[PDB]
Amino acid sequence: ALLSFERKYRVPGGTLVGGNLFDFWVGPFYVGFFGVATFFFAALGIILIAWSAVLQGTWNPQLISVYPPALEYGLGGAPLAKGGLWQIITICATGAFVSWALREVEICRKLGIGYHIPFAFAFAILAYLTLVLFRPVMMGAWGYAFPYGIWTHLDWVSNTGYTYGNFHYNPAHMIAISFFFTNALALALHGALVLSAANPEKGKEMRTPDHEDTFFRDLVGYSIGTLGIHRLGLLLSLSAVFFSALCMIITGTIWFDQWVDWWQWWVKLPWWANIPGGING
Amino acid sequence: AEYQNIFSQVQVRGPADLGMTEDVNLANRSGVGPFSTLLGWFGNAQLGPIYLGSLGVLSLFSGLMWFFTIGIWFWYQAGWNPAVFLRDLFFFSLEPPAPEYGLSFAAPLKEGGLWLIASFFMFVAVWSWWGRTYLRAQALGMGKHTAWAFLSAIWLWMVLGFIRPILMGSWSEAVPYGIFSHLDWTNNFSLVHGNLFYNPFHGLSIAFLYGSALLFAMHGATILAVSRFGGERELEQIADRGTAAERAALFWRWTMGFNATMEGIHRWAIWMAVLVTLTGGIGILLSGTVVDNWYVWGQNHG
Amino acid sequence: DLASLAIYSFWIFLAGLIYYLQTENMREGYPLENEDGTPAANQGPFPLPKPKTFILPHGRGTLTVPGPESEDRPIALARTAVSEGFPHAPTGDPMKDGVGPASWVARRDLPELDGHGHNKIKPMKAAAGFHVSAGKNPIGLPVRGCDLEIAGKVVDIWVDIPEQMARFLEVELKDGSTRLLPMQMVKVQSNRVHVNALSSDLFAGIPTIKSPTEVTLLEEDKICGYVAGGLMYAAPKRKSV
Ligand code: BCL
Ligand code: BCL
Ligand SMILES: CC[C@H]1c2cc3[nH]c4c(c3C)C(=O)[C@H](C(=O)OC)c4c3nc(cc4[nH]c(cc(n2)[C@@H]1C)c(C(C)=O)c4C)[C@@H](C)[C@@H]3CCC(=O)OC/C=C(\C)CCC[C@H](C)CCC[C@H](C)CCCC(C)C
Ligand SMILES: CC[C@H]1c2cc3[nH]c4c(c3C)C(=O)[C@H](C(=O)OC)c4c3nc(cc4[nH]c(cc(n2)[C@@H]1C)c(C(C)=O)c4C)[C@@H](C)[C@@H]3CCC(=O)OC/C=C(\C)CCC[C@H](C)CCC[C@H](C)CCCC(C)C
Ligand SMILES: CCCCCCCC[C@@H](Br)[C@@H](Br)CCCCCCCC(=O)OC[C@H](COP(=O)(O)OCC[N+](C)(C)C)OC(=O)CCCCCCC[C@H](Br)[C@@H](Br)CCCCCCCC
Ligand SMILES: CCCCCCCCCCCC[N+](C)(C)[O-]
Ligand SMILES: CCCCCCCCCCCC[N+](C)(C)[O-]
Ligand SMILES: CCCCCCCCCCCC[N+](C)(C)[O-]
Ligand SMILES: CCCCCCCCCCCC[N+](C)(C)[O-]
Numbered sequence: 001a002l003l004s005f006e007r008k009y010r011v012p013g014g015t016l017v018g019g020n021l022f023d024f025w026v027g028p029f030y031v032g033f034f035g036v037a038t039f040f041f042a043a044l045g046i047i048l049i050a051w052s053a054v055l056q057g058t059w060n061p062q063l064i065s066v067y068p069p070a071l072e073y074g075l076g077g078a079p080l081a082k083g084g085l086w087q088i089i090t091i092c093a094t095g096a097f098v099s100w101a102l103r104e105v106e107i108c109r110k111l112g113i114g115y116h117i118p119f120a121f122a123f124a125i126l127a128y129l130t131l132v133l134f135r136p137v138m139m140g141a142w143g144y145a146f147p148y149g150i151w152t153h154l155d156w157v158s159n160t161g162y163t164y165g166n167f168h169y170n171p172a173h174m175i176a177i178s179f180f181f182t183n184a185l186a187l188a189l190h191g192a193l194v195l196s197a198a199n200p201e202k203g204k205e206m207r208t209p210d211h212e213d214t215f216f217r218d219l220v221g222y223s224i225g226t227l228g229i230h231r232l233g234l235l236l237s238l239s240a241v242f243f244s245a246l247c248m249i250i251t252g253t254i255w256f257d258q259w260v261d262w263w264q265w266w267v268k269l270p271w272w273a274n275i276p277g278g279i280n281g
Numbered sequence: 282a283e284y285q286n287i288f289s290q291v292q293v294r295g296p297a298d299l300g301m302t303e304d305v306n307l308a309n310r311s312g313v314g315p316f317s318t319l320l321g322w323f324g325n326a327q328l329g330p331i332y333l334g335s336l337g338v339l340s341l342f343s344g345l346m347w348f349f350t351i352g353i354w355f356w357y358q359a360g361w362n363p364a365v366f367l368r369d370l371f372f373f374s375l376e377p378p379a380p381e382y383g384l385s386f387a388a389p390l391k392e393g394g395l396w397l398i399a400s401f402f403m404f405v406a407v408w409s410w411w412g413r414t415y416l417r418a419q420a421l422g423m424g425k426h427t428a429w430a431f432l433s434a435i436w437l438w439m440v441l442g443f444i445r446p447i448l449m450g451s452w453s454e455a456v457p458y459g460i461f462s463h464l465d466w467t468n469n470f471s472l473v474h475g476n477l478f479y480n481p482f483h484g485l486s487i488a489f490l491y492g493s494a495l496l497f498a499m500h501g502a503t504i505l506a507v508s509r510f511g512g513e514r515e516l517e518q519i520a521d522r523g524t525a526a527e528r529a530a531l532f533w534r535w536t537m538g539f540n541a542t543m544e545g546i547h548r549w550a551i552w553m554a555v556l557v558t559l560t561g562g563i564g565i566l567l568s569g570t571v572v573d574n575w576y577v578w579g580q581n582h583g
Numbered sequence: 584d585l586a587s588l589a590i591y592s593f594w595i596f597l598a599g600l601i602y603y604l605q606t607e608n609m610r611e612g613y614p615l616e617n618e619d620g621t622p623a624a625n626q627g628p629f630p631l632p633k634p635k636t637f638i639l640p641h642g643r644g645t646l647t648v649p650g651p652e653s654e655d656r657p658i659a660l661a662r663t664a665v666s667e668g669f670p671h672a673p674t675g676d677p678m679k680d681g682v683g684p685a686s687w688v689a690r691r692d693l694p695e696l697d698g699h700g701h702n703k704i705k706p707m708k709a710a711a712g713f714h715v716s717a718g719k720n721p722i723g724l725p726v727r728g729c730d731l732e733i734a735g736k737v738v739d740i741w742v743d744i745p746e747q748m749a750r751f752l753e754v755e756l757k758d759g760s761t762r763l764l765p766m767q768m769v770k771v772q773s774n775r776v777h778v779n780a781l782s783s784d785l786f787a788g789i790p791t792i793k794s795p796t797e798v799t800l801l802e803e804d805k806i807c808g809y810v811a812g813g814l815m816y817a818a819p820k821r822k823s824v
């Protein structure tokens with residue numbers, strides 16, 4: 001079925017691979033060669049997960065967990081039951097995410113729009129690949145990756161953090177958090193702002209973008225503007241993920257001691273290192 | 282390359298925009314500030330005017346006194362020495378009264394009293410600022426969504442600083458004013474409550490925080506993707522749907538099988554954001570009042 | 584247990600919230616249609632919301648949604664298959680007919696107004712006090728198409744007054760008439776403005792504005808649609824670069 005305004009946009013073209021072979025929809029979904037790739041990788045993935053479930057001996061989704069090979073395997077392959085399936089499922093996962101991004105590119109091309117969405121998405125994928133691929137390769141073993149399980153992956157977050165003390169003290173991690181919290185602040189403000197203008201007090205006319213600038217200037221002395229704010233949200237959220245990837249790519253590789261102790265470089269600068277008093281003298 | 286519209290290629294400037302008037306008392310607006318060509322590559326170049334009536338003066342004064350109180354304590358901890366003050370900046374901490382004082386105000390200045398003074402000033406600064414968000418909306422005839430959203434953030438802060446300490450019977454449960462000390466507090470809070478990953482409200486709060494990054498990356502990217510058709514003019518796309526709004530919906534319909542409208546995406550937005558701190562504050566408020574140990578609780582409740 | 588009561592309640596609330604949000608996002612484009620424009624049998628499990636009315640400023644009326652959906656324009660496309668789900672081929676020139684990535688919507692044929700009821704977008708020549716404040720000024724630069732040929736010259740910038748931003752470049756053609764190019768679809772360079780989307784011969788067909796000192800929302804949509812369409816439809820004339 002189609003949206004009321006949709007038909008005029010469902011023209012041939014835009015595909016990256018296959019000409020018109022896969023230029024069609026199933027219901028609302030565009031297919032394309034990357035739709036077929038996505039389905040294949042996802043489908044194989046889910047089947048391997050399900051099989052892993054069988055070898056774990058559970059079907060509870062709060063218990064199913066697929067763990068990477070143990071550290072002893074290094075960066076080699078492992079038997080299916082003992083890490084192999086994780087390695088295959090990771091390849092399927094990566095294949096599905098990239099296929100999804102590339103399908104998104106095909107959709108942009110057909111729609112005549114910019115490529116900003118899949119570009120943004122590629123940041124998420126790179127964050128994923130940092131945890132399951134790049135970091136483990138630099139650390140020399142797949143077993144440093146997180147396992148695929150609803151709760152078991154949370155165990156991995158917590159064990160990995162406490163390996164370096166309170167992980168709060170990772171400076172890239174502080175920046176990352178700042179971007180996340182700022183992004184959510186920006187999202188609340190923007191949603192509230194547009195809605196406040198579209199849904200004014202009872203009986204009154206819709207406000208204008210000019211009212212939106214006025215509100216913010218009245219409140220904080222500045223307005224970023226309607227282009228600005230969409231640029232901002234995109235920057236805040238992509239920066240949050242970039243710094244997340246960064247904060248983990250350095251952990252266990254260039255820095256692997258307790259993160260609190262990193263801050264001693266500042267405290268020990270020579271001009272104040274030995275001045276008495278304060279917390280550190 | 283296609284130009285991607287993250288930064289502007291050419292800036293134009295006109296006379297300072299003094300804003301809409303509606304019901305605003307114009308005696309309380311400043312003149313305009315300077316223009317910043319630097320900001321203008323990315324957003325608007327104009328700074329000001331700002332509106333400062335009595336509630337604004339109150340809020341700022343109070344906010345500054347919150348900051349002066351903390352900073353006074355920091356310089357004292359630094360032995361009045363500027364080198365030490367910069368060196369140890371993130372280590373200084375203004376700490377609330379000991380458990381022994383409960384909720385009283387009887388503690389000495391160097392050992393709790395200053396913390397209460399600082400919190401007192403923060404409380405006034407934030408709530409008067411909350412009042413500003415309502416009142417500036419009202420003067421412009423606008424909806425109150427911002428004030429309602431800000432309230433969700435106020436909720437977490439109130440729970441951490443005021444409600445939960447009161448319910449627990451002492452100020453020793455509130456958060457210290459310090460960069461590192463507050464991070465230590467957060468970590469300790471989890472440990473002592475049996476690990477916040479087992480608090481379903483903490484999990485939800487994460488879903489929403491990540492979700493806000495997902496959603497604003499989606500939305501920001503989408504609007505910029507359709508900026509070649511005037512997409513960022515959202516109010517007028519609401520009032521008169523254009524090919525911007527239609528391409529945006531259909532991107533998502535074709536990708537994931539459903540889509541939003543230009544108005545509606547803002548409702549997904551406000552709520553994704555606001556539920557971060559709503560669920561968050563519930564999670565914290567329950568901790569140690571009703572649940573001492575989330576691991577334990579999780580064993581008895583799914 | 585009070586925490587169990589709160590999480591149970593929260594899930595009930597979140598399901599109602601999602602319900603409400605999905606129905607709010609059905610105020611445009613629904614009910615769903617078959618490819619021939621008739622109502623589809625399967626509308627989904629979410630019903631349409633109760634209408635709301637927006638009061639538009641400056642005597643421009645109201646909008647009530649949901650309401651009767653209708654394109655209000657001919658769609659020059661035809662089926663290429665005997666079953667649902669396939670593309671629809673342009674029956675003429677998709678750029679002229681305004682289909683595919685060249686599509687436009689039948690927006691109001693009036694200009695967008697600012698808070699004070701004045702046209703939001705003006706040529707900088709008619710915009711008191713407006714001037715280029717930073718970056719390379721494009722006025723005077725020749726305009727190049729993806730065929731690497733000159734299609735004309737920049738004679739003004741059309742600016743958003745309230746938001747103080749460049750929205751279009753006005754470009755004079757070989758015959759003396761002008762067209763608007765979206766600012767997001769041009770690359771201002773030191774010695775030219777380059778337009779990837781259109782080859783030089785397609786510039787004449789950019790849809791003209793009926794009054795030379797304003798644009799209407801309908802006109803913006805035709806211009807923006809047409810230029811975006813060129814990414815796909817001028818691909819044959821687009822040299823490697
Ligand atoms: C990012 C840093 C850490 C991490 C730290 C945390 C912490 C800490 C928490 C979670 C939580 C979640 N994480 Mg995790 N998580 C990581 C990596 C991932 C990856 C991945 C492929 O890279 C996935 C799919 C998930 C998925 C999830 C969800 C199970 C849960 C809610 C997330 C959410 O709303 O996000 C925002 C996204 C949306 C709102 C869009 C919807 C996404 C849906 C819900 C994903 C469902 C995934 C499904 C159950 C997995 C199987 C896929 C199928 C086999 C196809 N995480 C990495 C290892 N994650 C929370 C939880 O409650 O866990 C129990 C939580 O507290
Ligand atoms: C070792 C640490 C513990 C832990 C301990 C805690 C504790 C303790 C808390 C959280 C909380 C949260 N944690 Mg946790 N957390 C852990 C692991 C994680 C992980 C992870 C990947 O491992 C993630 C992603 C998170 C993520 C989150 C967030 C979802 C949530 C805070 C939301 C927010 O916006 O707060 C930021 C928003 C605010 C603080 C609101 C502020 C509003 C006020 C009004 C603003 C005033 C400004 C003032 C005037 C200053 C003005 C300055 C001007 C610029 C001048 N945690 C581990 C398990 N976490 C909070 C929560 O809700 O938990 C349920 C919380 O209390
Ligand atoms: C870079 C900024 C942020 C971002 C952006 C972003 N994400 C995006 C996009 C963008 C721009 C899309 O366009 C795309 C989308 O379609 O959204 C609707 C997407 C997307 N982000 C998603 C999720 C997601 N994004 C997240 C994060 C973020 N996304 C960032 C914070 C997170 C987390 C945990 O924070 C999650 C969970 C999906 C909804 C969607 C991409 C859907 C997709 O790739 O589908 C194809 C693949 C499948 C349908 C299934 C694959 C099955 C696998 C083969 C097996 C599963 C293996 C998996 C590793 C197990 C995980 C177990 C967990 C318990 C840990
Ligand atoms: C819903 C969840 C999210 C959220 C939402 C949210 N926050 C909000 C709002 C909303 C909806 C507002 O409306 C309100 C706002 O006004 O935003 C612009 C606010 C707000 N969120 C703020 C911060 C904030 N929000 C946060 C979080 C969040 N906010 C959540 C993620 C966080 C954290 C910790 O994550 C922070 C730190 C404030 C920007 C603002 C509330 C302002 C306030 O209460 O101010 C009182 C204090 C003062 C007035 C003192 C300020 C003093 C000045 C710096 C004067 C300077 C003069 C000096 C002489 C200059 C010299 C120095 C210079 C050279 C630098
Ligand atoms: C550090 C930022 C975080 C702050 C946290 C709190 C929320 C944010 C708020 Br509290 C901050 Br950003 C606001 C603080 C701003 C304080 C500004 C001082 C005001 C001032 O000096 O006014 C005095 C003075 C008196 O004018 P008057 O005599 O009325 O003139 C005649 C009136 N007329 C023309 C109509 C006839 O005004 C002037 O002439 C100077 C103009 C002031 C410049 C405008 C301020 C710009 C502000 Br500080 C911007 Br750059 C803030 C930047 C963004 C902040 C974003 C925060 C959210 C993330
Ligand atoms: C609020 C965010 C502040 C933005 C400041 C950063 C802007 C730098 C822009 C440089 C881009 C210049 N140029 C010519 C390449 O477009
Ligand atoms: C009034 C309630 C307090 C809740 C949490 C307070 C933590 C503040 C974070 C440290 C601020 C230190 N600072 C900015 C003064 O340098
Ligand atoms: C937050 C939970 C994550 C999973 C949500 C999956 C939603 C799928 C929506 C697809 C809709 C497709 N269709 C034809 C049914 O509309
Ligand atoms: C990711 C989509 C979240 C929406 C699903 C939550 C609604 C489920 C509500 C019924 C579950 C049973 N219970 C315990 C709440 O009554």
Ligand SMILES: CCCCCCCCCCCC[N+](C)(C)[O-]
Pocket residue numbers: 538539601605626627628629
């Ligand atoms: C995080 C929750 C996001 C999932 C929202 C689920 C909405 C599915 C809507 C499908 C209905 C589409 N339809 C058939 C009405 O066109």
Ligand SMILES: [Cl-]
Pocket residue numbers: 052065066067081082083
């Ligand atoms: Cl396993």
Ligand SMILES: [Cl-]
Pocket residue numbers: 284285286287288289
């Ligand atoms: Cl750019």
Ligand SMILES: [Fe+3]
Pocket residue numbers: 190194230500504515
């Ligand atoms: Fe928006």
Ligand SMILES: [K+]
Pocket residue numbers: 707708709710711712713714
């Ligand atoms: K002028």
